[PDB]
RNA sequence: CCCGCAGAAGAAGCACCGGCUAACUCCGUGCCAGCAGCCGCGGUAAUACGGAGGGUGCAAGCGUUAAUCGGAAUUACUGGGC
RNA sequence: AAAUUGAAGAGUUUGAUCAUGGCUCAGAUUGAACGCUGGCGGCAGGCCUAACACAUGCAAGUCGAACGGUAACAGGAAGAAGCUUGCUUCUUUGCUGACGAGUGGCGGACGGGUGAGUAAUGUCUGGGAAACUGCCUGAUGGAGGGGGAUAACUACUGGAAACGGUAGCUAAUACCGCAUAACGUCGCAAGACCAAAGAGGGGGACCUUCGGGCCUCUUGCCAUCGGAUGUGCCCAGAUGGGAUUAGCUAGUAGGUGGGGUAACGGCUCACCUAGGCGACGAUCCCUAGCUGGUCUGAGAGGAUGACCAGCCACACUGGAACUGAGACACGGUCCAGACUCCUACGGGAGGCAGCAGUGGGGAAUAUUGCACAAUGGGCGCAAGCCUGAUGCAGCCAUGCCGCGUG
């Protein structure tokens, strides 16, 4: 459950280190963002020579939440903290080329095949 | 993982296991001697020293440890035992 | 060596309208299997790297096709697929001379279309022996015979239908051949790769009988003895039919048309067989004409067989994703062998020939040997531009082709970051070498660069190639039109005195200049300074000071800030002060009198007026006429030559900065425009007053 | 830095890549470099016959 | 490497010419266009700019640009001064 | 004998002079670049920048004379069939020649590349004690002697690949014992302890349980003591700039004892002392590989450290170790990090500062060449194999030199 003002972390090597959700895309009055959801982020921190600079606004997809995912068998897969994967603003196409930490089967999509292939688990 | 002389890796791992076993045995016997010394009897320390002295010599002679290492082990141990009683 | 007997090579390319299945067929053509079984050399086939050592799909593929159930030995068929957009038509220009034959693909429902006639003209310029494929028989509303007749009446060709269609849409399962007299229905159900003949199908037997008879008449008119033999009541054998049809197909007689569906994979398997049967070999196509640097015509016919010294033809430089050169080279005669030396005979430059690469079965094979008719590519540093010859030091220097299309759409361009003008300079430098149908400019009104390309899309797929290839972003814009200004019909008799004497060494200058306009372009220099000073009123050693201080203002111009041409000047009367008059006194006094007499001589602002000729199909005459009038342009005669209408109109240049894309919309892509600056005139537009202080106030 | 453009007539502009060498001008206080003509978009002067390697002019073969 | 060579035949250019520095006239320009290593030249006879002739130097190189030492006894230990 | 013989000035401050004083020039040199030209040959040199990222190919293998074996060309056989009467075109055979893969051995730590790091754990000069060294070599002897495994393989099996599982004796110069032992280890002495391995060539009998055995030769192995080589360590002097860096240090500086190394050592640990370095410049900061030497100079010096040779350092970045005589290891391992590439998404793979080469950076620096024929190196008894060392070729007036264009 990611919402506006949520200080996420970054799961890829796009260069950002701490971001913030500034809008949850999809439908009016939408409140929360699930793991699969694409949101809009402002970069609150980055590395000196990273591919992105601090203060940039672009999209992102979530990959880990403390709230966690739920499975059709009822099982819940929670994580230790929130994390996302930055995406280029027009075509999603994650900026980074690496990915840290696990992801979920809820991300095995036609779009995040890249993310799901670069991910060290699930 | 590049050149077929990568069999030196598996060969060296096997030799590492073997040398580790022999080293652990040798130092276990040396620790036998030293604990017997800290306990404070000459006969027990001397027993353990006579039991390790072939071990250290056979290890030096086999290429595991060096002649001088076994030498100074025996030397410091005999000195400790002689002062110990 | 040249084990695949060179006299068997077929060099050909498939050309058609956009989304016509040229790429679908290229892919289908390539189902050659031969994996787990070299099919070649009756040894060493290309099979070693059929093991996929390097995986890639590249242009100009080579292939071995034995035959569709009737087979005759490995042939390396060499294929250059062709694109379909007029935007990028140079890839079809260069890849038509390089070609021996051409498979004119066609949409069985779309028929012949702007690009199909366009590539038809392209091939006619090189007289390429072309046979035609008719793709898309499954789509509803597709009929082979109608498209066949379209060729007969839209291109003025003689479309002999050496095949026939068995059904349409779902019905399509096979094709009635007129020589086998059988209709092979392929085993698409298990795999198209499997095939089967069928004896005399009843559905088309009446239609096939009449159409087959028509084919025999073409075989007959093919040879004079044959014609009389055809009048002997006797039919033709499996060799005189084809050998008669083939022997002139080499010489541009008639285009053979076969139907099929590369989606459902029928018709195609047979199409490959027809290419061997009728399309020319480097030994079947006539020998190439040649020439040296000075000898107006050293005949230089290079016999194709590689017994002449190495003599190739390079047709395309490539931005290889890794190598960075990959200039493809088509060897006509001679043999270069894994390291040799040849010169840029068109450029007068010299370098070696290192790493030939020929990609077959989509595996990028590396070759140390390329021979007669053998299409390949080269990795090197020295540039060889498209259509540039690669002959031996023997040097049949020039090959006749010295032709590239002139850009039809020109657009300005500048980067997003102000410090990538150098990077955008170097990127456009490279992307200008990669295709000759893409100019780059530097006009003198301003340093602004102009990327003049063929079509809207042609230069719209290059604004993003810099984004992709050279990671530089650019923002395009309409080119700035050169606006010069002048006085119009108002003579004025004005005074200008420059004097600042309030110290020891001041300046004094004075002039009375009667500014009157000249006829718009009646004298070469455009300007006119006549001096009517008398009495040595101005010293006279300062008369050229007056001229050099007036024609320096012609560059700037008072009204908006833009050049002044076509005005006369009469230095009626001045005055001087010997101590204070100076060169830079009658330079300034004349300037002042100019820009105070210009504020009252009725200055106007002029615009460039082109001379636009449009080659347009008759029906759309009124349309382009109306759009030329929509633009503030005036028409001057519209003679109608046959198969086009010639429409002249001196349209302003400002009203033409995207014309052709719009014109193509108006003409169904069947017209082009040629414009050339003629004169100047005026139309009320303070848009030039809008652009005064935005840049360089 | 600023640099001198020698010879009679040049075709240099705002965005022209060039090649710069050393050498003061002794006239312009602050111009401590030169522009090698005939190199990197600096065109050789109009048919200079004397001192032709300087100023970058290739030769008439006569 | 050594012999058959018919045949001068396939092979010369670059910088400079005011002083230092060695090599001078004319034309066209007229504090302009331009040169310049330092001093400097060009405002109507310019040995200094541009060109032609001539010469000088070097030559499969020539010239320019770096860059180090020398000259510099201008960091002076040999070998300086207030 | 000769080993050196070596030292120049000019323009410019001024109306002129002297002086002080800077600037410029005359010379030599270069890893050179650029402009214009361009014939040849010889010799040499050719990323000075991004120790930036690297596609592709090759740079470290070898030994059936250590071993189990046997994918082939064969042989030696069993030889079958067609039988041209065994031309044996055909079938079985590790029994040899040889060899795929596998255990084992030696090498892979040499050679090759860069100068990032390092202002001293580096280098040079000269010495010290507390040392160890594969192959090489000189001696002295030894070389009783048991079987407990495991690879290939067989079998099942996992996986796209790397690479595995799970039982079986295999076999060995692989491993561990029991022998036995000293001018060996340790103990002051008394004393105890420590190894090995066999293969090849043939011995007319000199045996035939059918290869005698063991005294036939060559190696191989073990042990100490030397030589030699290589390496480790220590000290003193010299090895840059900066005080617009003056105080720095807590294992720090010493002691004892325990441990540790091949070796002395705060190398380490614990206790004890409070010391130790610093204007002869500690610390801090910047820069830099060092040297023999190259350039210039009469010299003293100034600059420099490209090629060549010695030393050091590093190997995608940080750390660790393992095997080993020698590494804390370019082309090994493990981990972490940054990065990139495959995927049949479950998993993997890599490290050009080797040769060539690509992109890039740059004013600018070469072929993805030939060959192991010498020379050298590794393996081997040796033929032979490998050697991107090396020897040569290619490009480039980049330089020195010779010659040419009459
Ligand atoms: N319906 C139908 N479509 C076809 C047939 N052959 C090709 N196509 C389709 O037309 C499209 C053409 O794409 P492409 O081959 O890139 O066109 P090209 O670039 O001109 O060749 C492809 O998606 C094919 O699916 C056919 O017989 N029937
Ligand atoms: Mg002159
Ligand atoms: Mg003085
Ligand atoms: Mg072998
Ligand atoms: Mg004693
Ligand atoms: Mg020592
Ligand atoms: Mg690197
Ligand atoms: Mg490497």
**Domain total for chain A?**
1
How many C-beta atoms lie closer than 10 Å to residue C46's C-beta? 23
Q: Tell me if C208 sits within 8 A of C200, measured CB to CB.
A: no
C48 three-class SS: helix
Cβ burial, residue C244 (10 Å; 0-12/13-18/19+): buried
In this structure, the dihedral spanned by the alpha carbons of residues C519, C520, C523 and C528, taken in order and rounded to 10 degrees, is 70
Q: Tell me the CA–centroid distance for residue C285 and ligand 5, in Å.
A: 110
Quickly list DSSP for C452-490.
Answer: EESSHHHHHTTTTHHHHTS---EEEEPPPP---EEE-S-
D12 CB contact with strand E at below 7 Å: no
Find the DSSP H helices in C113-164. Answer: 114-126, 144-154
What is the β-pairing status of strands C10-15 and C76-81?
parallel
CA angle C307, C308, C310 (to 5 degrees): 105
Looking up tokens 């009495």 gives: C535
In this structure, the dihedral spanned by the alpha carbons of residues C305, C311, C317 and C320, taken in order and rounded to 10 degrees, is 60
Q: What is the CA radius of gyration of chain A?
A: 13
Report the C-alpha gap between C646 and C651 in whole angstroms: 15
Partners of D14 on chain C (C-beta within 8 Å) are 447
Partners of D13 on chain C (C-beta within 8 Å) are 442, 447
Hey, what are C86's tokens? 């007029």
Cβ burial, residue C241 (10 Å; 0-12/13-18/19+): buried
Report the C-alpha gap between C671 and B33 in whole angstroms: 105
Instruction: For CA atoms C551, C557, C558, C561, give the dihedral sign.
Output: negative
C567 three-class SS: strand
- Chain D interface disruption, residue of C412, C413, C425, most D CBs within 10 A: C425
CA distances from C681 to C70, C165, C677 (A): 72, 61, 12
**What is the CB-side half-sphere exposure of residue C213 using CA atoms within 13 A?**
6
Partners of C696 on chain D (C-beta within 8 Å) are none
B21 CB contact with strand F at below 7 Å: no
How many C-beta atoms lie closer than 10 Å to residue C329's C-beta? 25
Distance of CA C349 to the CA centre of its chain: 26
In this structure, the dihedral spanned by the alpha carbons of residues A99, A100, A105 and A107, taken in order and rounded to 10 degrees, is -40
Nearest CA in chain D to C449: D15
Report the C-alpha gap between C673 and C653 in whole angstroms: 13
Give, to the nearest 10 degrees, the angle between helix C543-550 and helix C583-597.
Answer: 50
Report the C-alpha gap between A77 and D38 in whole angstroms: 70
Q: Tell me if C283 sits within 8 A of C168, measured CB to CB.
A: no
**What is the CB-side half-sphere exposure of residue C509 using CA atoms within 13 A?**
25
Looking at the DSSP bridge assignments, the partners of residue A62 are: A84
**Strands, E assignment, C521-660:** 527-531, 567-575, 603-605, 607-609, 612-615, 634-635, 646-650
Nearest CA-CA partner of C365 in C352, C374, C356: C356
Hey, what are C205's tokens? 């037997």
Question: CB-based contact (8 Å) between C442 and chain D?
Answer: yes
How far away is chain C from the Cα of D54, in angstroms, using its nearest Cα? Answer: 24
Nearest CA in chain C to D13: C447
Distance C395 CA to F208 C1' (A): 87
Find the DSSP H helices in C401-455. Answer: 421-433
Report the C-alpha gap between C403 and C389 in whole angstroms: 13
In this structure, the dihedral spanned by the alpha carbons of residues C264, C266, C271 and C274, taken in order and rounded to 10 degrees, is 180
Report the C-alpha gap between C611 and C650 in whole angstroms: 5
Residue C168 region, left (φ>0) first, then alpha (ψ -120 to 50), else beta? beta
How many residues are recorded in chain C? Answer: 697
How many C-beta atoms lie closer than 10 Å to residue A44's C-beta? 14
How far away is chain D from the Cα of C635, in angstroms, using its nearest Cα? Answer: 39
Q: After which residues, if any, is chain D broken (C to N > 2.5 Å)?
A: none
Query: For C460-476, b where at least 16 C-beta lie within 10 A, e where not — what string?
Result: eebbeebeeebebebee
Do C and B share at least 3 CB pairs under 8 Å?
no
D44 CB contact with strand F at below 7 Å: yes
Q: What is the DSSP letter of C622?
A: H
Extents of the domains making up chain B = 1-85
Q: Tell me if C256 sits within 8 A of C277, measured CB to CB.
A: no
What are φ and ψ of residue B37, in 5° steps?
A: -70, -50
Q: What is the largest CA-CA distance in chain D?
A: 42
Name, in order, each residue with C-beta under 8 angstroms of A88's C-beta and a sequence gap of 6 or more.
A58, A59, A94, A95
CA angle C209, C210, C215 (to 5 degrees): 95
Looking up tokens 């004005």 gives: C494
What nucleotide is nearest D61 when CA is compared to C1'?
A: F37
Neighbours of chain C (3+ CB pairs under 8 A): D
Report the C-alpha gap between C146 and C108 in whole angstroms: 8
Report the C-alpha gap between C610 and C656 in whole angstroms: 9
CA distances from C373 to C12, C98, C396, C428 (A): 11, 10, 17, 33
Name, in order, each residue with C-beta under 8 angstroms of C479's C-beta and a sequence gap of 6 or more.
C410, C411, C412, C443, C448, C450, C657
Binding site listing of C: 16-23, 81-85, 135-138
How many C-beta atoms lie closer than 10 Å to residue C532's C-beta? 11
Partners of D15 on chain C (C-beta within 8 Å) are 421-422, 425, 447
**Strands, E assignment, C245-303:** 257-259
Q: Tell me if A34 sits within 8 A of A106, measured CB to CB.
A: yes
Q: Tell me if A2 sits within 8 A of A19, measured CB to CB.
A: no
Q: What is the 3-state secondary structure (H, E, C) of chain B?
A: CCCHHHHHHHHHHHHHHHHHHHHHHHHHHHHHHHHHHHHCCHHHHHHHHHHHHHHHHHHHHHCCCCHHHHHHHHHHHHHHHHHHC
B82 CB contact with strand F at below 7 Å: yes
Looking at the DSSP bridge assignments, the partners of residue C603 are: C487
Nearest CA-CA partner of C34 in C75, C64, C71, C4: C64
Query: For C302-318, b where at least 16 C-beta lie within 10 A, e where not — what string?
Result: bebbbebbbbbbbbbbb
Report the C-alpha gap between C642 and C381 in whole angstroms: 48
User: Which residue owns the Cα nearest ligand 1 atom 1?
Assistant: C139
C688 three-class SS: helix
D60 CB contact with strand E at below 7 Å: no
Distance C52 CA to F89 C1' (A): 39
Q: Tell me the CA–centroid distance for residue D58 and ligand 2, in Å.
A: 19
Query: For C273-293, b where at least 16 C-beta lie within 10 A, e where not — what string?
Result: bbbbbbbbbbbbbeebebbbe
Looking up tokens 């959700």 gives: A21
C201 three-class SS: coil
Hey, what are C308's tokens? 């002449």
Q: Tell me the CA–centroid distance for residue C135 and ligand 1, in Å.
A: 8
CA distances from D21 to D6, D25, D39 (A): 12, 12, 11
In CATH, what number is assigned to the domain containing residue A69?
Answer: 2.40.150.20
Looking at the DSSP bridge assignments, the partners of residue C365 are: none
Which range of residues forms the domain containing residue A94? Answer: 1-122
In this structure, the dihedral spanned by the alpha carbons of residues C263, C268, C272 and C275, taken in order and rounded to 10 degrees, is -110
D7 CB contact with strand F at below 7 Å: no
How many C-beta atoms lie closer than 10 Å to residue C668's C-beta? 12
How many C-beta atoms lie closer than 10 Å to residue C444's C-beta? 8
Report the C-alpha gap between C531 and C551 in whole angstroms: 14
Partners of C421 on chain D (C-beta within 8 Å) are 15
C588 three-class SS: helix
Report the C-alpha gap between C543 and C574 in whole angstroms: 10
Name, in order, each residue with C-beta under 8 angstroms of C659's C-beta and a sequence gap of 6 or more.
C409, C631, C673, C675
Bases along strand E below 7 A from a protein CB: 13-17, 32-40, 50-52, 61-67
Q: Tell me the CA–centroid distance for residue B79 and ligand 5, in Å.
A: 14
**What is the CB-side half-sphere exposure of residue C267 using CA atoms within 13 A?**
32
Report the C-alpha gap between C299 and C285 in whole angstroms: 17
How far away is chain C from the Cα of D17, in angstroms, using its nearest Cα? Answer: 7
Name, in order, each residue with C-beta under 8 angstroms of C581's C-beta and a sequence gap of 6 or more.
C507, C508, C509, C538, C539, C542
What are φ and ψ of residue C104, in 5° steps?
A: -75, 90
Pocket test for ligand 1, best of C80, C263, C461 (most atoms within 8 A of CB): C263
| Experimental structure resolution, Å | 3.1
Binding site listing of C for GTP: 16-23, 81-85, 135-138
Nearest CA-CA partner of C74 in C99, C51, C46: C46
Q: Tell me if C314 sits within 8 A of C389, measured CB to CB.
A: yes
How many C-beta atoms lie closer than 10 Å to residue A23's C-beta? 15
Q: What is the DSSP letter of D4?
A: B
Quickly list DSSP for C89-121.
Answer: -HHHHHHHHS-S-EEE--BTTTBS-HHHHHHHH
Q: What is the CA radius of gyration of chain B?
A: 17
Cβ burial, residue D21 (10 Å; 0-12/13-18/19+): exposed
User: Which residue owns the Cα nearest ligand 1 atom 2?
Assistant: C136
CA distances from C584 to B15, C542, C546, C577, C587 (A): 98, 9, 9, 13, 5
Q: What is the 3-state secondary structure (H, E, C) of C302-370?
A: ECCCCCCCCEEEEEECCCCCCCCCCEEEEEEECCEECCCEEEECCCCEEEECCCCECCECCCCCECCEE
Q: Tell me if C485 sits within 8 A of C607, measured CB to CB.
A: no
D25 CB contact with strand E at below 7 Å: yes
Q: Tell me the CA–centroid distance for residue A96 and ligand 7, in Å.
A: 22
How many residues are recorded in chain B? Answer: 85
Q: Which positions 54-73 on chain B have a beta carbon less than 7 angstroms from any atom of strand F?
A: 54, 57-58, 60-63, 65-73
How many residues are recorded in chain A? Answer: 122
Looking up tokens 């082709």 gives: C401
Closest atom of ligand 1 to C81 CA is 21
**What is the CB-side half-sphere exposure of residue C163 using CA atoms within 13 A?**
28
What are φ and ψ of residue B69, in 5° steps?
A: -65, -50
Element (H, E) at C590: helix C583-597
Name, in order, each residue with C-beta under 8 angstroms of C227's C-beta and a sequence gap of 6 or more.
C220, C221
What are φ and ψ of residue C278, in 5° steps?
A: -125, -30
Q: Which positions 13-42 on chain A have a beta carbon less than 7 angstroms from any atom of strand F?
A: 13
C422/D15 touch (CB, cutoff 8 Å), yes or no: yes
Hey, what are C469's tokens? 């290839």
| Expt. technique | cryo-EM
Report the C-alpha gap between C59 and C79 in whole angstroms: 8
Residue A68 region, left (φ>0) first, then alpha (ψ -120 to 50), else beta? left
Report the C-alpha gap between D7 and D5 in whole angstroms: 7
Which residue, counting CA atoms, is nearest to the C1' of nucleotide E43? C583
Report the C-alpha gap between C331 and C304 in whole angstroms: 9
Report the C-alpha gap between C247 and C51 in whole angstroms: 39
Element (H, E) at C219: helix C205-222
CA distances from C188 to C27, C173, C263 (A): 16, 9, 11
CB of C22 shorter than 6 A to ligand 1: yes
**Strands, E assignment, C508-548:** 508-517, 527-531
Report the C-alpha gap between C654 and C609 in whole angstroms: 9
How many residues are recorded in chain D? Answer: 62
Pocket test for ligand 1, best of C13, C17, C22, C24 (most atoms within 8 A of CB): C24
Looking at the DSSP bridge assignments, the partners of residue A94 are: A87
Hey, what are C180's tokens? 């086998």
Neighbours of chain D (3+ CB pairs under 8 A): C
- Chain C interface disruption, residue of D14, D15, D17, most C CBs within 10 A: D15
D46 CB contact with strand E at below 7 Å: no
Report the C-alpha gap between C483 and C604 in whole angstroms: 10
Report the C-alpha gap between A119 and C642 in whole angstroms: 66
Bases along strand F below 7 A from a protein CB: 34-37, 55, 60-61, 102-108, 131-133, 162-164, 175-178, 184-188, 192-195, 222-224, 258-263, 322-325, 329, 331-333, 338-341, 343, 345-347, 349-351, 358-360, 363, 367-368
Q: What is the CA radius of gyration of chain D?
A: 12
CB of C20 shorter than 6 A to ligand 1: yes
Q: What is the CA radius of gyration of chain C?
A: 33
CA distances from C647 to C114, C410, C609, C621, C660 (A): 20, 21, 16, 8, 14
């Amino acid at each position: 459950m990611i919402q506006e003002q949520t200080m996420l972390n970054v799961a890829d090597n796009s260069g950002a280190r701490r971001v913030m959700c500034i809008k949850v895309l999809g439908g009016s009055h939408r409140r929360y963002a699930g793991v699969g959801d694409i949101i809009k982020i402002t970069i609150k921190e980055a590395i000196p020579r990273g591919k992105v600079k601090k203060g940039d606004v672009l999209k992102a997809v979530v990959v880990r939440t403390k709230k966690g995912v739920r499975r059709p068998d009822g099982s819940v897969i929670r994580f230790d903290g929130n994390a996302c994967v930055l995406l280029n603003n027009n075509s999603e196409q994650p900026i980074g080329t690496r990915i840290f930490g696990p992801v979920t089967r809820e991300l095995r999509s036609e779009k995040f095949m890249k993310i799901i292939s670069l991910a060290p688990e699930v | 993982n590049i050149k077929s002389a990568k069999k030196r890796a598996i060969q060296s791992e096997k030799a590492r296991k073997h040398n580790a076993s022999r080293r652990s045995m040798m130092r276990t016997f040396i620790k036998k001697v030293y604990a017997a010394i800290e306990a404070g009897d000459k006969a027990a320390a001397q027993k353990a020293f006579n039991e390790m002295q072939p071990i250290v010599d056979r290890q030096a002679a086999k290429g595991l440890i060096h002649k001088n290492k076994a030498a100074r082990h025996k030397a410091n141990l005999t000195a400790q035992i002689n002062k110990l009683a | 060596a040249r084990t695949t007997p060179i006299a068997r090579y077929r060099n050909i390319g498939i050309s058609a309208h956009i989304d016509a299945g040229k790429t679908t067929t290229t892919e289908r053509i390539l189902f050659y299997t031969g994996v787990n079984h070299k099919i070649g050399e009756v040894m060493d086939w290309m099979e070693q790297e059929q093991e996929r050592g390097i995986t890639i799909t590249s242009a100009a593929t080579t292939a071995f096709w034995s035959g569709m159930a009737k087979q005759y030995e490995p042939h390396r068929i060499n294929i250059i697929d062709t694109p379909g957009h007029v935007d990028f038509t140079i890839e079809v220009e260069r890849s038509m001379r390089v070609l021996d034959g051409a498979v004119m693909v066609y949409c069985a429902v779309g028929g012949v279309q702007p690009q199909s006639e366009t590539v038809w003209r392209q091939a006619n310029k090189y007289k390429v022996p072309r046979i035609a494929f008719v793709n898309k028989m499954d789509r509803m509303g597709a009929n082979f015979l109608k498209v066949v007749n379209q060729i007969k009446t839209r291109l003025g060709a003689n479309p002999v239908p050496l095949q026939l269609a068995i059904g349409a849409e779902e019905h399509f399962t096979g094709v009635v051949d007129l020589v086998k007299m059988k209709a092979i229905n392929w085993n698409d159900a298990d795999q198209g790769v499997t095939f089967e003949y069928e004896d005399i199908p009843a559905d088309m037997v009446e239609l096939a009988n009449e159409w087959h008879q028509n084919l025999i008449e073409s075989a007959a008119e093919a040879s004079e003895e044959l014609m009389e033999k055809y009048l002997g009541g006797e039919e033709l054998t499996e060799a005189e039919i084809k050998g008669a049809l083939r022997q002139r197909v080499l010489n541009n007689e008639i285009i053979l048309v076969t139907c099929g569906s590369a989606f459902k994979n029928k018709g195609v398997q047979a199409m490959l067989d027809a290419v061997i049967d009728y399309l020319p070999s480097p030994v079947d196509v006539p020998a190439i004409n040649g020439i040296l640097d000075d000898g107006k015509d050293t005949p230089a016919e290079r016999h194709a067989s590689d017994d002449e010294p190495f003599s190739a033809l390079a047709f395309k430089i490539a931005t290889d994703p890794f190598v960075g050169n990959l200039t493809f080279f088509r060897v006509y005669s001679g043999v270069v062998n894994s390291g040799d030396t040849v010169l840029n005979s068109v450029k007068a430059a010299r370098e070696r020939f290192g790493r030939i690469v020929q990609m077959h079965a989509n595996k990028r094979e590396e070759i140390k040997e390329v021979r007669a008719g053998d299409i390949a590519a080269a990795i090197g540093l020295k540039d060889v531009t498209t259509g540039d010859t690669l002959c031996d030091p023997d040097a049949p220097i020039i090959l006749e082709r010295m032709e590239f299309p002139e850009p039809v759409i020109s657009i300005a361009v500048e980067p997003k970051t102000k410090a990538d003008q150098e990077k955008m300079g170097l990127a456009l430098g490279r992307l200008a070498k990669e295709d000759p149908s893409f100019r780059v400019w530097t006009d003198e009104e301003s340093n602004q660069t102009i990327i003049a390309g063929m079509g809207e899309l042609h230069l719209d797929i290059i604004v993003d190639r810099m984004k992709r290839e050279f990671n530089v972003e650019a923002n395009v814009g309409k080119p700035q039109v050169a606006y010069r200004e002048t006085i119009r019909q108002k003579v004025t008799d004005v005074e200008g005195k420059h004097a600042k004497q309030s110290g020891g060494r001041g300046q004094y200058g004075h002039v009375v200049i009667d500014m009157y306009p000249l006829e718009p372009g009646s004298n070469p220099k455009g300007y006119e300074f006549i001096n009517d000073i008398k009495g040595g009123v101005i010293p006279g050693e300062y008369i050229p000071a007056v001229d050099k201080g007036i024609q320096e203002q012609l560059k700037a111009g008072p009204l908006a800030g833009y050049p002044v041409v076509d005005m006369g000047i009469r230095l009626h009367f001045g005055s001087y002060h010997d101590v204070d008059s100076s060169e830079l006194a009658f330079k300034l006094a004349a300037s002042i009198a100019f820009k105070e007499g210009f504020k009252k001589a009725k200055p106007v602002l002029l615009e460039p007026i082109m001379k636009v000729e449009v080659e347009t199909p008759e029906e759309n005459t009124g349309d382009v006429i109306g759009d030329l009038s929509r633009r503030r342009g005036m028409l001057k005669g519209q003679e109608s030559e046959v198969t086009g209408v010639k429409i002249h109109a001196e349209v302003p240049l400002s009203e033409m900065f995207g014309y052709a894309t719009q014109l193509r919309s108006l003409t169904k892509g069947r017209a082009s425009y040629t414009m050339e600056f003629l004169k100047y005139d005026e139309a009320p537009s303070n848009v030039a007053q809008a652009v005064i202080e935005a840049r360089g106030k | 830095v600023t640099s001198y453009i020698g010879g009679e007539g040049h075709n240099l502009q705002e965005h022209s890549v060039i090649l710069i060498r050393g050498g003061r001008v002794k006239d312009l206080p602050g111009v401590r470099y030169h522009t090698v003509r005939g190199a990197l978009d600096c065109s050789g002067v109009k048919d200079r016959k004397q001192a032709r390697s300087k100023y970058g002019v290739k030769r008439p073969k006569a």
